[PDB]
Amino acid sequence: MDPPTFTFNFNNEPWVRGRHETYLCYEVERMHNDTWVLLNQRRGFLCNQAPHKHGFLEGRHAELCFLDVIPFWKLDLDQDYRVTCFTSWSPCFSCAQEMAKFISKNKHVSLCIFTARIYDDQGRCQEGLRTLAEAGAKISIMTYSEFKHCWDTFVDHQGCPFQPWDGLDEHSQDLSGRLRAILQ
Ligand SMILES: [Zn+2]
Numbered sequence: 001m002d003p004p005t006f007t008f009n010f011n012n013e014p015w016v017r018g019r020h021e022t023y024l025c026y027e028v029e030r031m032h033n034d035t036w037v038l039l040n041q042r043r044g045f046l047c048n049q050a051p052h053k054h055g056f057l058e059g060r061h062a063e064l065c066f067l068d069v070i071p072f073w074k075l076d077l078d079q080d081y082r083v084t085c086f087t088s089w090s091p092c093f094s095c096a097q098e099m100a101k102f103i104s105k106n107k108h109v110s111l112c113i114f115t116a117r118i119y120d121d122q123g124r125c126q127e128g129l130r131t132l133a134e135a136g137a138k139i140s141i142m143t144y145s146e147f148k149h150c151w152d153t154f155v156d157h158q159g160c161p162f163q164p165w166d167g168l169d170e171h172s173q174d175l176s177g178r179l180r181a182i183l184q
Contacts, residue, residue, distance in 0.1 A: 001023070001025075001045055001154050001155050001156065002155075002156055003155055003156065003157060003160075005023070006023075006150070006151065006154070006155045007165070009021065009023045009088040009116075010023070010086075010088050010116045010142070010147060010150065011116075011165060012116050012117055012142070012168060012171040012172055012175065013165075013167065013171060014117070014171065014174075019088065019089070019117075021047050021048055021050075021062075021088070022047060022048050022061065022062040022063070022087060022088055022089045022119075023045060023046070023047045023062065023087070023088045024045060024046055024047065024062045024063070024065075024066055024085055024086070024087045024088075025043075025044070025045040025085070025086040025087075025150055025153070025154045026043065026044060026045065026066065026083065026084065026085050026086075027040075027042075027043045027083075027084045027153070028041035028042045028043070028074060028081055028082070028083055029041055029081065029082040029084075030076075030079060030080070030081055030082075031079065031080030031081060031082065031110075033079075033080075038082055041074070041075075041081065042074060043153065043154075044069075045154050046062060046065050046066060046069070047062055047065075048060060048061050048062040048065065049061075049065060061091075061092065061094075061095050062087065062095075063087075063091045063092075063095035063096075063098065063099060064095060064098065066085065067098060067099065067102055070102075077108070078108070079108060080108050080109075080110070081108060081109050081110065082110045082112070083109055083110065083111050083112070084111075084112045084113075084114065085111070085112070085113045085114065086114045086115075086116075086142060086146060086149075086150050086154075087113065087114070087115045087116065088115075088116045088117065089115065089116070089117055089118070089119045090113070090115040090117070090118045090119045090120070090125070090129065090139070091113070091119065091125075091128060091129075091132070092119055092121065092125060092128065093121070093123070093124035093125050093127065093128040094128075095128075096125070096128030096129060096131055096132045097128060097131055099111065099113075099132055099135075099137065100131050100132045100134070100135035100137065101135075103135050103136055103137055104135050104136075110138075111136075111137040111138070112137070112138040112140070113132070113137055113138065113139050113140070114140050114141070114142045114146045115139070115140075115141060115142060116141075116142045116147075117175065118141070118175055118178060118179060118182075120178075120182075126182045129179070129182055129183060130182070130183055133183055139179070139183070140179075141172060141175045141176045141179050142172065143169070143172045143176075144164060144168060144169060144172070147162065147164070147168065148162040148164075
């Protein structure tokens with residue numbers, strides 16, 4: 001992922017101004033049946049698929065595309081895995097139920113979703129996040145740590161260390177208060 005795209009998409013300044021896409025970075029770690037440790041399996045990122053006459057007519061949300069790539073495009077099936085997602089926006093109502101379905105029917109997948117901004121259409125989105133948590137997914141807001149991790153792991157930084165934008169911590173704190181209230 002190029003630096004301008006990351007910084008533009010994962011900036012946590014409340015404004016819904018220009019950010020019409022949803023980027024999603026994922027990491028997969030095998031549980032390991034004996035010890036306490038996790039094993040690196042794979043990683044990657046993706047974004048939504050805008051409506052297109054030569055593709056998905058009704059559009060393809062990043063969350064749906066993510067679930068599309070999991071299907072045995074990875075491996076195993078009888079092992080426990082940790083799946084972590086860093087998304088620029090939290091899932092819509094429809095994608096939340098879809099992800100909640102996945103983790104409910106699988107059991108061998110621990111899903112942790114870290115989001116930069118909280119979609120919240122003020123309608124059913126809030127309910128969707130409660131459904132995902134009910135399903136056992138960890139839903140949390142990205143802080144300095146998650147932003148830096150993604151920068152170091154998913155960005156072509158060309159050696160440049162991560163440089164936090166002003167207010168990152170502030171917006172991160174506020175969003176955390178809103179999410180905690182949404183859930184409970
Ligand atoms: Zn969606």
